[PDB]
Amino acid sequence: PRIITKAQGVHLWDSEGHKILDGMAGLWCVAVGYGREELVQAAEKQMRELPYYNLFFQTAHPPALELAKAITDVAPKGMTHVFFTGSGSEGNDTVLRMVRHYWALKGKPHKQTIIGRINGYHGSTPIPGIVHIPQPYWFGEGGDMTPDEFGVWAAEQLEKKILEVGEDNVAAFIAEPIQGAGGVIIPPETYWPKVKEILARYDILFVADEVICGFGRTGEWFGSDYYDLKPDLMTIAKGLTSGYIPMGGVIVRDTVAKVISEGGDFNHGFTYSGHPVAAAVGLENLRILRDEKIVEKARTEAAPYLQKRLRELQDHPLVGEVRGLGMLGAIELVKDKATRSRYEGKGVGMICRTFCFENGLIMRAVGDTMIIAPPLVISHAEIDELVEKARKCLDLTLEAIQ
Amino acid sequence: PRIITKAQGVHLWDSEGHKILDGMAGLWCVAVGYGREELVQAAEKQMRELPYYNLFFQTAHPPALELAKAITDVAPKGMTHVFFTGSGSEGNDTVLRMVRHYWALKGKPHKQTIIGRINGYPGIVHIPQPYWFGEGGDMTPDEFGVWAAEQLEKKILEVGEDNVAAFIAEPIQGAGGVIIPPETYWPKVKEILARYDILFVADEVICGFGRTGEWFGSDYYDLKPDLMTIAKGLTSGYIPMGGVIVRDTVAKVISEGGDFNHGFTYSGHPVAAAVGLENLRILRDEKIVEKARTEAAPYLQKRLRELQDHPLVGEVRGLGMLGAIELVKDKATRSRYEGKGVGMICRTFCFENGLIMRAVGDTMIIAPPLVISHAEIDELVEKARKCLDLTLEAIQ
């Protein structure tokens, strides 16, 4: 039984004193790495000054506002409003309400169906008003097409579905820039360009799920920045606080915010914001990401090296592919690299995960896809640690297959 | 907006150094009062040791478990499962999923309609609230209660048992002005629920963790709920967290029998749990809940009721650490100062005189920290009177 005693930077240590590199940044979230005392201190300060309560009585510099202001500053242009939640998934629920409630107020209440992709639908409990298009997963679902052309097809499928459902019954299309959860499904070059093209010609809202891509994970602040999308709403969480304290929220384009306020501010609960203690943490977490240039350094210094290094693993017999951008990476485990076939039923990723655990690496396995989203602050040294331990474990996995 | 610099016990101080008594315990939540360093220290400790989960490994004593264990210990008997959320309202959403998903797995997917009450929450239907003071006209409290309870049975039949998933109610409606039910209500509702195959959800977001004097409102009115939404006083509002407590029989049906929506991550944020656990440790181990029941509550209630003499007060009501004051133009008919917005004025004068009572229309309400002292109750009822006198004066 293996118990963690201490955590620092990108590393955990067990009771035995064995060092572990957390390649998944806690669970997608721990951006600035473990043990940043500044965040602890933010929380502490607020918790004793005034833990809860806003409006009528409030602190000298309410963290709710200053955090929102901070978020809108790093957001895509046009995104001026932030409605905070206690979690990321609460964010996605909230956005579903907001898009439907939005269209109602425009006097088009028929607009209700949400178009998701396969393997990124979310909760929402087939519901006679959430439909799916195929995911842009070339490696698994693109057979023998070129990435580029597969992308275009998977993008066109959106247009088809909008028409099939009918524009006047569609409320919104909603997608993670990169699905990352379903195994870092990085789209072909051509996808988002084409989806942009489509969205431009239909009167539907566009929700970027930045729960995972948010706050530096792509190298840019948001995946929406990276793929250059113009979303109407953005769900955030996780890296908002580097996972040091629960918080989520929705960033909202001005034009949309104005509609859920004017007309009817009943459901616009004059942004009671979120919890002061969470916000205080979030604000310091954002201050740190911008002011110590961690996002910038991820883009310019960590990312390029991580990607290069990770790709060296392509030589390994077991690896059908390495893919990744920013601080996202994935490794496909195949029986034959040519046909991209898997070790059917053997559950190989499981084995590879096992060996990662045993050898002081945290990669997550999504089926036969190993994935990584390490803290944005990982060093060259630590990337060397990572790709090294990765290889050890790939060798062990292969060995174990015989 | 007045600028608070520090908070202690049941008191805030502004920049001017003026002392303010928070009669609403933050917003229903701050149970143990402000500035308990123990809670700050719990959060701090966890935030640096291990702020969030990872796929593989965990700390020596994960606070998620220890908190759930702690909750199940204070819960009504049978309540063995806790699914945590990031908020209270996320709890109520979650429970809506759970009750519907529950019935589906029993092979009765038509069971979906939720029966709420008016002023607390086809899809979702409502019955009338047990608010004798406003909506009972000239009936006796007892008989009005029975009627308001019978209205449930009527609605179940109207909707039809095979389409009803659940009935869902706060034991006492906090939000909507401390709507304390007649004696007879909950007894009768129990009677009704006993004869229909529907689930019963207690919304303990507000009544939870001592507010009634017992741990839960469900304890107090002696209800046998199938699910309980919690939040707020779980951490004394020091850090956001919520959850659902779930009867064994229900939990067994949503886990095995229909392996689906209990993996995932409902395990709850370690940092929040650490706080929650210490908050609960404090409530049980320093006997705050017990002392609320036995020492604080009786005195608060007594004292508060002295205000009944005031011209403006149609009624004082309250149990445990809940209280309400009705502001009327004529005590006989229970009429209000229609349209004058009197509660507004009374609230205003409370703010200006270092008291936080919340106004729900013309109902002033209080839910002070469970730790309020006799001294502080004296402070409260005293400032209350001052402000009632000021409000009345201002009406001329």
Author numbering:
A (entry chain B): 34 to 158, 176 to 452
B (entry chain A): 34 to 154, 179 to 453
From the primary publication:
Omega transaminases (ω-TAs) can mediate the chiral amination of several unnatural substrates without the requirement of an α-COOH group and are highly relevant in the production of several pharmaceutical intermediates of commercial interest. The overall structural fold of the TA_5182 and TA_2799 enzymes is similar to that observed for other class III fold type I TAs with two α/β domains.
We determined the structure of TA_5182 in both relaxed (open) and closed states, mimicking the cofactor-free and the cofactor-bound form of the enzyme, respectively. The open state of TA_5182 is not easily observed. It shows a distinct conformation in the overall ternary structure of the enzyme, which allows the cofactor molecule and the substrates to enter the enzyme’s active site via movement of the flexible loops. In our crystal structure of the apo state of TA_5182, the electron density of the roof loop is visible. The major conformational differences can be found in the roof loop and the outer loop in the open state of TA_5182. Y322 is initially in a hydrogen bond with T127.
